[PDB]
């Protein structure tokens, strides 16, 4: 069938600049004088939204800055000028004949200036301690770029075990990321120690941002 | 108003079968094709097949032998059935529609999708814990030890939307954990109530946790 090869896999574009995504088909998707090439945008937690149909026609609710072009086997989606809400996954799709097929997708994000995280730490809740578990939570909010390191310490000694990390998708308004880091111990081990510390190292500061508390 | 809604089993044991119903309104099935699309977590869209306005069907080339699509026009329902699911079949499953014309409504209307997890692990409700601290103040909600995905988190029944981050769930020992943070002006908390609202449909769990100062 008609295989669609979508390029790039991912890229980041700064505000006001141009994002160019390409879709090449293994054979022509033209018939009856038109190209059966469609483009979709997909935001986190949402179904895809139609952007472009018939290679170059804009769907309902689709801003002028999204433009489709091409014919035959070579197609492009251009987004210019890039805006914050355009961070998303993008897919091409051919509908010339069965089976209908999709390109592999492009993750398009915003390139923006560095921003330091805002760090907060949370002791285990009284509710959780009753169940014999103890989770310590560190939020690192609204930073850029996505790369960041969290080091946990218990009574001053690094703890690289029982830690789970999770990043949000890029924010659609300020283009930042956030991350949660959760250290989970048995209640018995938690009650054995005093100081719990989350250290956030990010390219925006010489020294870590440190949040800490005593049990 | 064109609308589609998937109903699926949520959790499927390996080698068992999958049945999803797409219920539609605002259009007649005899005038539309209804298409099935799936998306493995973090991966791309895959066209599974369609039942066209005429009532015939077509399928994905590689999956055709495991797939069956049918419809009940009187009930405005389209059905997907898939045989012997394996871990590779874990995915969000969507229905979408397109008329007999090629125009701006081409795949313009989708269901919200239903997540199908292929696993023999046990459905487990979450434990929900409030995260209070030890100008602006940040609070949280810890949603621990549930299976399968998804959960929904809101703050103050949705009235509190700005300053909210809900972090993707992470799997450990066949149980998911996620957290949500919300940042509000310190003048409003604890003077005003802040409550996370958590739902885990698979276990029919619904719970509110007020964030109270320690």
């Amino acid at each position: 069938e008609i295989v669609l090869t979508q390029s790039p896999a991912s890229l980041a574009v700064s505000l006001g600049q141009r994002a160019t995504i390409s879709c090449r088909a293994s054979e022509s998707v033209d018939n009856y004088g038109i190209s059966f090439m469609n483009w979709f945008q997909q935001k986190p937690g949402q179904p895809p939204k139609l952007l472009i149909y018939a290679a170059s026609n804009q769907g309902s609710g689709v801003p002028a800055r999204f433009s489709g072009s091409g014919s035959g086997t070579d197609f492009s989606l251009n987004i210019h000028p890039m805006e914050e809400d355009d961070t998303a996954m993008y897919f091409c799709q051919q509908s010339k004949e069965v089976p209908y097929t999709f390109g592999g997708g492009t993750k398009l994000e915003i390139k923006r200036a560095d921003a330091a995280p805002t760090v907060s730490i949370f002791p285990p809740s009284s509710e959780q301690l009753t169940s014999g578990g103890a989770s310590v939570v560190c939020f690192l909010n609204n930073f850029y770029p996505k790369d960041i390191n969290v080091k946990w310490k218990i009574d001053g000694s690094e703890r690289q075990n029982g830690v789970l990390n999770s990043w949000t998708d890029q924010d659609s308004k300020d283009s930042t990321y956030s991350m949660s880091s959760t250290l989970t111990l048995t209640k018995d081990e938690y009650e054995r120690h005093n100081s719990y510390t989350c250290e956030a190292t990010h390219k925006t500061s010489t020294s870590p941002i440190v949040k800490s508390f005593n049990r | 108003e064109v609308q589609l809604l998937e109903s699926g089993p949520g959790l499927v044991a390996p080698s068992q079968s999958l049945s999803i119903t797409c219920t539609v309104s605002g259009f007649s099935l005899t005038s539309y094709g209804v298409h099935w699309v799936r998306q493995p977590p973090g991966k791309g869209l895959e066209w599974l097949g369609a039942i066209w306005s005429a009532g015939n069907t077509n399928y994905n080339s590689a999956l055709m032998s495991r797939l069956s699509i049918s419809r009940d026009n009187s009930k405005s329902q389209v059905f997907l059935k898939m045989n012997s699911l394996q871990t590779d079949d874990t995915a969000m499953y969507y229905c979408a529609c397109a008329p007999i014309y090629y125009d701006y409504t081409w795949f313009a209307y989708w269901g919200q999708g239903t997540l199908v997890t292929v696993s023999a692990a046990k459905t487990t409700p979450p434990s929900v814990y409030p995260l209070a601290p030890g100008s602006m103040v940040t609070l949280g909600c810890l949603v621990k030890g549930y299976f399968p995905e998804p959960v929904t988190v809101t703050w103050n029944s949705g009235s509190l939307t700005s300053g909210v981050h809900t972090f993707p769930a992470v799997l450990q020992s066949d149980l998911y954990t996620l957290s949500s943070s919300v940042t509000v002006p310190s003048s409003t908390w604890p003077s005003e109530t802040v409550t996370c609202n958590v739902a885990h449909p698979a276990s029919s769990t619904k719970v509110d946790k007020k964030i109270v100062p320690r």
Binding site: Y32, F36, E97 | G33, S53, A54, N56, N58, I100, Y101
Partner: peptide, 11 residues
């Protein structure tokens, strides 16, 4: 006018 009632486009 393109029409697709059965999986194939025709005019």
């Amino acid at each position: 006018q393109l029409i697709n009632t059965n999986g194939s486009w025709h005019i």
